[PDB]
Design a protein around this ligand. Structure first.
Ligand SMILES: CCCCCCCCCCCCCCCCCC(=O)OC[C@H](COP(=O)([O-])OCC[N+](C)(C)C)OC(=O)CCCCCCCCCCCCCCCCC
Ligand SMILES: CCCCCCCCCCCCCCCCCC(=O)OC[C@H](COP(=O)([O-])OCC[N+](C)(C)C)OC(=O)CCCCCCCCCCCCCCCCC
Ligand SMILES: CCCCCCCCCCCCCCCCCC(=O)OC[C@H](COP(=O)([O-])OCC[N+](C)(C)C)OC(=O)CCCCCCCCCCCCCCCCC
Ligand SMILES: CCCCCCCCCCCCCCCCCC(=O)OC[C@H](COP(=O)([O-])OCC[N+](C)(C)C)OC(=O)CCCCCCCCCCCCCCCCC
Ligand SMILES: CCCCCCCCCCCCCCCCCC(=O)OC[C@H](COP(=O)(O)OCCN)OC(=O)CCCCCCCCCCCCCCCCC
Ligand SMILES: NC(=O)C1=CN([C@@H]2O[C@H](COP(=O)(O)OP(=O)(O)OC[C@H]3O[C@@H](n4cnc5c(N)ncnc54)[C@H](OP(=O)(O)O)[C@@H]3O)[C@@H](O)[C@H]2O)C=CC1
Ligand code: SF4
Ligand code: SF4
Ligand code: SF4
Ligand SMILES: [Zn+2]
Lengths: 115, 176, 146, 342, 48, 209, 96, 155
């Protein structure tokens, strides 16, 4: 039952190799992206954001899911490197317009009914 | 059955070869095309002098929406909400309550004309010929809000366009 | 048909008393602050609560905890139930233990001091069902009602 | 609260915030940012405008349907003001010219008109009045712009005692007339400065910070009746600030000292323009007026805002003053300006 | 219409109106329904 | 066939297509799981997802088939099934004037083998499936989004994706660019419950549970 | 008929009017509130009751297929007038 | 009197702009065919002085004729920003006016007025060539009422 067709990785050790390789490519590419897209952020800010995205999923332990996340990341790399994206797409990771939303009970209580 | 569009071979006699050479050197076929454009120049143009002349239309034309009345002046709509249900665009919003005389009538009848596709399904569905796509097509606005129609707007359009609307229905109700 | 009363005489905004002594609209911040100040000041039996008929269990326990943390156990209802003997210690003392569905299997029913037609319209309808299909016998110790 | 002004939603475009605002002088540098933040959270904004409607088109996309309403008004018609504030909970005054037209003076735009809006706003029962003055407004200043600001600041406070009065420093942004003013001086060769700009200290503030603080003053009960001072994180010497502007713009910087009397006469020569003057004798004095340090007044940190450094938002303003060679140079290529420590 | 005239109803407009967009006579949308939830009006007397 | 309103039946095709289904099942037992022919005469072959290339190549190249054209390749989301995604191949044979449907299955994480080696038309169809449903086709020349916006996160055609999505776009003058924000609708989509409580088609009545 | 509120706003045939303290009446400043002056409740009442000689009468609204679905109205109660559920027309049975 | 001069000069500059409206060759979907039909012999937008030019730099009017998706939206703002001023936008069809029949889609901007300012809204799906022409002529009248120089004199 648990026997399942793999995507690329046969174990988490082989998958975590692809995660690290992907982080390398992203880390090289932020300096060019800031220059090419003419963004008003720093290279450190972009490299921090890459770290944040890689940290969000820091809990997964399924080799197949990690492969898909790596596949999706690599696609976003082809888009950004080849300038298929635009300045609006690259800057959507930073959520500049979204004013900070309350994250404490009292603040949520004063504004609305949401959990 | 089928036919070949370009599977003809040329004639290699000298007269034919010479004729093609003349076509190549004296541009006969190109000159031929210039004649057609010259003929069109001396034809009457197909242009109409809008807005003093209008393009032809039919009684079935689907245009600006209107809410109609019986000859008494009573609203035909009974709030059945069939138009709301069939609208492919969810452009119609209806709320109803019993009127002071006990009649089933609407308190809200809103059509978002920027959601409408002008399909006429709502005038097909109506069982009392209350909602109609009228003849008018010249209701462009300077703002979006002016195209969010409420009940009063749709009733004024009916009272504005009733004479034309009724006559068109008289012409096409036998096909419907 | 009582759902239409939920659209009338509703409380929509927090209210506090002004200098004149009249309730005026305010904000959650102000109203909760006025309430919390007295809760800190008073303690023990000086703090009490009364629960109404349409109160949820989540709020009931919540209020209990808040008043317990000021060492107040005066958590009260509006509906009396004898506190003598085992009072509320045992559930069986204050529950319809036979269940609503049990009336169908009963042979005799004795009703004391209650009009089940109006206090529990759907429970009386269950009694009449057994009265009709299982030939139940019903007795009453109270005012003669229909 | 009337049932219509009770907040609903998650603070988006289609939400309701309970703020029905009349913003005078909304067609300018500060207003377009104020209206945008107002319309982000679902507020009803009345935009009374004097100008051609074509010049208000950039505001229409800032709010959902019906949430931006446009009215015509005249600063000399007290009734036109009344129609615009009678249904509003907060009124914001952003009216001002950096020059004196034939019809309107500095007195008209900083004293007479603001008092009229305040007088009418109170008669119509407006809860809140937010007035923008200047950090360096003073009765004894050389600049008439700043002296008239002080007069209006006092008239507003006497007419509308609960009015929140906000006193910004020089504001820098894409449409500022501060960093762009300096960068366009390249047209005239070098940069004329008084005493070479070693005696003037500036504390410029980002436009968004001002916009956030104004908005938070609307939503803060405490702000009522107070006077705020919106200043930037750091203080700079005019010479160093001007030099930083040119470095970011990658344009040659040729500072030369120009005495006080001369750079006054150049202003009078640029004031003859029937259109918008490139510079004026007043703007001269203001650029070279050292920004006051007002510790007795509350600041942005009291309204919840965090001051934005010039070093992070200068490039967005000054990259349009670059040539193709230097357009792509990044934000880390220009070493930041020297700062006067506190 | 000079030959075959339209039918006459009382409710039909006697005076036609050209497009009124951009003018003071323009149509402004609004909701035609009354309020849903009534709200408790507090007593006008000072209790205690 | 004299009933004016009822679709005529063609039994000759039903017998022909049924036999060809037996023909395929006999030749490809290793992968074929089910063969069915419909009332309106269409043959469906249902296969294990590991026989996509073998089965498609046989149908394309066998002399008693010659399905040289891939008319369409799509997917269907059925959440209740543990393998929620049904991959459907519709093929056309010009030689025999016939159509055949091939069906297989997969889940969110299990890849399917790309059919590009068999039909070069499948390149874009497979990209659309990935973009819209999130199914990964292994050994594809270039698998990337084709219909969704750049950076779009999610697979819209899954039955669990909201119709109006999670984000919406607008232009913000402050940042002078188009920005994405969470979706808020002035008028919520009105869900109409149209199904009737009374059964309509007895012949499809599902056996009681 | 159109009656005006103390503020001056016109009331609609649905009874809608903005109360004094509602901000939403600012949308009508410099523009107008569009209200149809022909109130259908008033116009139907003007139509005379029809005297008929049967316990049951039919109504199609007039025009045949251009009216409303045909219905039959009972006129056996002499304390009221039979009314159509579609067109609002009233009928009464004439004492034989 | 200078109020007379600005008024006549204002008339001239308005007359030229409304008498030489050059739309950008820009369409998105099935409202564009009806725009072609406004360019065709029967209606001949050219006779009014309306000439289609591809480049945004040589354009005065953007007619948004079709459904604006989210992928497309950044491009529409770009070409709009690249149009020299004065510039006007006509919204043609339900899809552009408010999303129309894809209004509830994840991939559709619920109106082009979220992306760019709009001067005229033409309702329909599709609007007829005659109805678009009514909108163009309505834009011409809007320009005729502009008071840019009269306002400048009183500024
Ligand atoms: C008699 C004593 C001795 C003296 C003898 C003097 C020589 C006389 C005989 C020479 C014949 C020369 C024929 C003319 C030149 C041939 C040009 C040619 O090479 O054509 C081949 C070319 C090529 O035709 P092609 O299709 O065959 O191209 C392929 C060529 N092969 C196959 C050989 C590789 O034709 C064209 O030039 C087409 C031009 C297209 C543009 C046409 C625009 C419309 C113009 C219409 C108006 C023309 C009238 C203008 C009048 C101006 C008035 C001021
Ligand atoms: C307002 C103005 C009104 C008056 C305008 C004057 C007439 C203008 C041109 C009309 C065109 C008519 C078309 C036509 O008759 O050509 C048909 C024919 C069509 O030819 P074809 O290509 O279809 O084939 C026939 C020819 N053979 C048999 C060889 C294959 O073209 C001609 O024969 C005309 C040849 C004229 C060549 C002119 C080019 C030489 C120019 C030298 C410089 C002068
Ligand atoms: C060329 C070289 C550069 C320019 C040099 C200086 C200008 C010289 C050219 C002047 C052109 C005048 C054009 C007149 C406009 C016209 O034809 O009126 C028709 C229009 C016609 O009305 P319409 O525009 O509403 O037409 C609508 C379409 N129809 C009619 C079919 C329904 O008349 C007017 O409505 C008034 C328009 C303004 C009139 C011109 C004002 C300026 C005149 C003084 C200019 C000098 C001031 C100093
Ligand atoms: C070859 C053919 C050559 C033809 C040349 C054209 C000849 C006819 C020209 C008529 C005058 C055109 C004036 C155009 C000015 C721009 C405009 O439309 O006004 C907007 C502006 C509006 O000014 P404003 O100050 O009120 O507002 C603009 C500022 N913002 C954007 C912030 C609102 O006009 C002006 O700024 C001043 C115009 C003065 C009057 C016209 C120019 C006189 C100077 C002549 C040199
Ligand atoms: C003698 C020495 C005098 C040196 C001081 C001269 C005064 C300073 C001149 C710069 C004025 C800056 C300015 O704002 O106007 C210049 C004007 C461009 O203004 P603009 O870029 O359109 O500002 C719009 C902001 N939203 O115009 C320009 O684009 C460039 C500057 C004018 C051209 C000069 C010739
Ligand atoms: N660095 C800065 O920019 C600082 C600004 N302030 C104050 O902030 C406020 C706005 O700043 P800013 O927005 O940059 O000023 P802008 O000049 O950018 O826009 C100001 C507004 O005032 C309006 N206005 C000016 N005069 C009149 C008048 N006579 N009648 C009607 N409306 C008028 C204009 O409308 P129109 O264009 O239609 O005339 C314009 O929209 C001003 O009061 C300014 O003094 C304070 C400190 C610093
Ligand atoms: S015409 Fe079609 S889309 Fe428009 S309101 Fe009627 S049913 Fe809806
Ligand atoms: S279908 Fe006709 S009668 Fe029914 S609600 Fe719609 S308009 Fe009214
Ligand atoms: S508005 Fe109508 S014509 Fe235009 S793209 Fe949408 S459906 Fe097609
Ligand atoms: Zn009837």
């Amino acid at each position: 039952s648990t026997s399942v067709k793999p995507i690329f990785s046969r174990d988490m050790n082989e998958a975590k190799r692809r995660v690290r390789e992907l982080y390398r490519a992203w880390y090289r590419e932020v300096p060019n992206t800031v220059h090419l897209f003419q963004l008003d952020i720093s290279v450190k800010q972009g490299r921090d954001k890459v770290r944040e995205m890689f940290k969000k999923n820091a809990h997964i332990t399924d080799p197949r899911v990690v492969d898909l996340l790596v596949i999706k990341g690599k696609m976003e790399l082809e888009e950004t490197i080849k300038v298929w994206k635009q300045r609006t797409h690259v800057m959507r990771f930073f959520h500049e317009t979204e004013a900070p939303r309350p994250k404490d009970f009292l603040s949520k209580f004063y504004v609305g009914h949401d959990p | 059955t089928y036919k070949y569009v370009n599977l003809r071979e040329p004639s290699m006699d000298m007269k034919s070869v010479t004729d093609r050479a003349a076509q190549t050197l004296l541009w006969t076929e190109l000159i031929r095309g210039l004649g057609m454009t010259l003929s069109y120049l001396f034809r009457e143009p197909a242009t109409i002098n809008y807005p003093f002349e209008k393009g032809p239309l039919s009684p079935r034309f689907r245009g600006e929406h209107a809410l109609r009345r019986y000859p008494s002046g009573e609203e035909r709509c009974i709030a059945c909400k069939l138009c709301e249900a069939v609208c492919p665009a969810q452009a119609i919003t209806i709320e109803a309550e019993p009127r002071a005389d006990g009649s089933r009538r609407t308190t809200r009848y809103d059509i978002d004309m920027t959601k409408c596709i002008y399909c006429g399904f709502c005038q097909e569905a109506c069982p009392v010929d209350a909602i109609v796509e009228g003849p008018n097509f010249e209701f462009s606005t300077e703002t979006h809000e002016e195209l969010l129609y409420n009940k009063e707007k749709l009733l004024n359009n009916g009272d504005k366009w009733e004479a034309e609307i009724a006559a068109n229905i008289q012409a096409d109700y036998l096909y419907r | 048909f009582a759902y239409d009363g939920l659209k009338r005489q509703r409380l929509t905004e927090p209210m506090v008393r002004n200098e004149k002594g009249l309730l005026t609209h305010t904000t959650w911040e102000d109203a909760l602050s006025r309430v919390a100040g007295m809760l800190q000041s008073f303690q023990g039996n000086d703090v009490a609560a009364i629960a109404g008929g349409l109160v949820d269990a989540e709020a009931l326990i919540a209020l209990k905890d808040l008043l317990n943390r000021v060492d107040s156990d005066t958590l009260c209802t509006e509906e009396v139930f004898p506190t003598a003997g085992a009072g509320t210690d045992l559930r069986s003392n204050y529950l319809l233990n036979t269940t609503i569905a049990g009336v169908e299997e009963a042979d005799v029913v004795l009703l004391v001091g209650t009009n089940p037609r109006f206090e529990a319209p759907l429970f009386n309808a269950r009694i009449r069902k057994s009265w009709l299909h299982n030939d139940l016998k019903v007795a009453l110790i109270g005012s003669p009602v229909d | 609260l009337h049932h219509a002004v009770i907040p609903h939603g998650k603070g988006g475009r289609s939400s309701v915030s309970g703020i029905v605002a009349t913003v005078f002088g909304a067609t300018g540098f500060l207003g377009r940012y104020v209206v945008n933040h107002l319309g982000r959270m679902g507020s009803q904004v009345i935009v009374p405008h004097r100008c051609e409607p074509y010049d208000t088109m950039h505001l229409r996309p800032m709010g959902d349907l019906g949430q931006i309403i446009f009215m015509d008004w005249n600063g000399r018609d007290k009734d036109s003001i009344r129609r615009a504030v009678e249904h509003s909970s907060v009124v914001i005054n952003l009216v001002g010219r950096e020059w004196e037209t034939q019809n309107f003076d500095f007195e008209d735009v900083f004293v007479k008109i603001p008092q009229a809006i305040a007088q009418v706003s109170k008669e119509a029962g407006v809860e809140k009045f937010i007035h923008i003055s200047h950090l360096n407004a003073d009765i004894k200043s050389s600049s008439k712009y700043l002296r008239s600001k002080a007069v209006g600041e006092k008239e507003v406070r006497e007419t509308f005692p609960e009015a929140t009065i906000i006193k910004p420093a020089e504001i820098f942004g894409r449409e500022d007339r501060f960093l762009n003013y300096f960068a366009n001086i390249r047209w005239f060769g070098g940069v004329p400065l008084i005493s070479l700009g070693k005696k003037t200290v500036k504390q410029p503030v980002y436009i968004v910070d001002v916009t956030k603080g104004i908005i938070n003053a609307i939503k803060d009960p405490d702000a009522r009746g107070k006077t705020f001072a919106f200043v930037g994180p750091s203080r700079y010497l005019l010479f160093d600030l001007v030099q930083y502007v040119f470095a970011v713009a990658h344009r040659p910087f040729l500072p030369y000292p120009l005495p006080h009397f001369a750079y006054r006469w150049i202003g009078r020569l640029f004031e003859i323009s029937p259109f918008e003057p490139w510079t004026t004798r007043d703007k001269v004095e203001r650029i070279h007026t050292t920004d006051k340090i007002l510790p007795h007044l509350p600041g942005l940190e009291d309204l919840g805002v965090e001051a934005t450094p010039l070093e992070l938002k200068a490039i967005e303003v000054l990259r349009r003053h670059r040539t193709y060679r230097w357009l792509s140079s990044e934000i880390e290529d220009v070493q930041p300006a020297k700062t006067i420590p506190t | 219409p000079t030959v075959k005239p339209p039918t006459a109803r009382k409710f039909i407009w006697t005076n036609h109106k050209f497009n009124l967009s951009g003018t003071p006579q323009q149509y402004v949308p609004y909701s035609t329904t009354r309020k849903k939830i009534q709200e408790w009006v507090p007593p006008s007397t000072p209790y205690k | 066939d004299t009933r004016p309103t009822v679709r005529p039946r063609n039994d000759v095709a039903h017998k022909q297509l049924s036999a060809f289904g037996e023909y395929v099942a006999e030749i490809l037992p290793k992968y074929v799981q089910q063969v069915q022919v419909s009332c309106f005469n269409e043959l469906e072959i249902c296969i294990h997802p590991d026989g996509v290339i073998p089965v498609l190549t046989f149908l394309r190249d066998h002399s008693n088939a010659q399905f040289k054209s891939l008319a369409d390749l799509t997917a269907v989301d059925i959440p209740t099934r543990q393998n929620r995604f049904e991959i459907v191949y519709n093929l056309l044979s010009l030689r025999f004037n016939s159509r055949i449907r091939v069906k297989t299955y997969t889940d969110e994480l299990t890849p399917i083998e790309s059919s590009v080696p068999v039909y070069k038309a499948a390149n874009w169809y497979e990209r659309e499936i990935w973009d819209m449903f999130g199914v990964f086709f292994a050994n594809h020349p270039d698998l990337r989004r084709i219909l969704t916006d750049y950076g779009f996160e999610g697979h819209p055609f899954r039955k669990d994706f909201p119709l109006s999505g999670y984000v919406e776009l607008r232009y913000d003058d402050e940042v002078k660019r188009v920005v994405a924000e969470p979706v808020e609708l002035a008028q919520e989509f009105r869900k109409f419950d149209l199904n009737s409580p009374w059964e309509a088609f007895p012949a499809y009545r599902q056996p009681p549970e | 008929g159109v009656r005006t509120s103390p503020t001056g706003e016109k009331v609609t045939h649905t009874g809608q009017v903005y109360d004094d303290g509602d901000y939403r009446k600012v949308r009508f400043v410099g523009r107008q509130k569009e209200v149809n002056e022909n109130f259908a409740i008033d116009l139907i009442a003007e139509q005379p009751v029809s005297q008929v000689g049967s316990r049951v009468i039919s109504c199609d609204g007039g025009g045949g297929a251009l009216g409303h679905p045909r219905v039959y109205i009972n006129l056996d109660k002499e304390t009221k007038t039979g009314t159509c559920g579609y067109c609002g027309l009233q009928f009464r049975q004439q004492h034989h | 009197r200078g109020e007379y001069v600005v008024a006549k000069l204002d008339d001239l500059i308005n007359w030229a702009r409304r008498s030489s409206l050059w739309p950008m060759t820009f369409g998105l979907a099935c409202c564009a065919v009806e725009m072609m039909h406004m360019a065709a012999p029967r209606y001949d937008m050219d006779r009014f002085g309306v000439v289609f030019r591809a480049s945004p730099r040589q354009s005065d009017v953007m007619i948004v004729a079709g459904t604006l998706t989210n992928k497309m939206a950044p491009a529409l703002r770009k070409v709009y920003d690249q149009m020299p001023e004065p510039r006007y936008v006509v919204s043609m069809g339900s899809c552009a006016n408010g999303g129309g029949y894809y209004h509830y889609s994840y991939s559709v901007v619920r109106g082009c007025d979220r992306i760019v300012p709009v001067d005229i809204y033409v309702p329909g799906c599709p609007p007829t060539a005659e109805a678009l022409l009514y909108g163009i002529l309505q834009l011409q009248k809007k320009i005729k009422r502009e008071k840019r120089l009269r306002i400048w004199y009183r500024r």
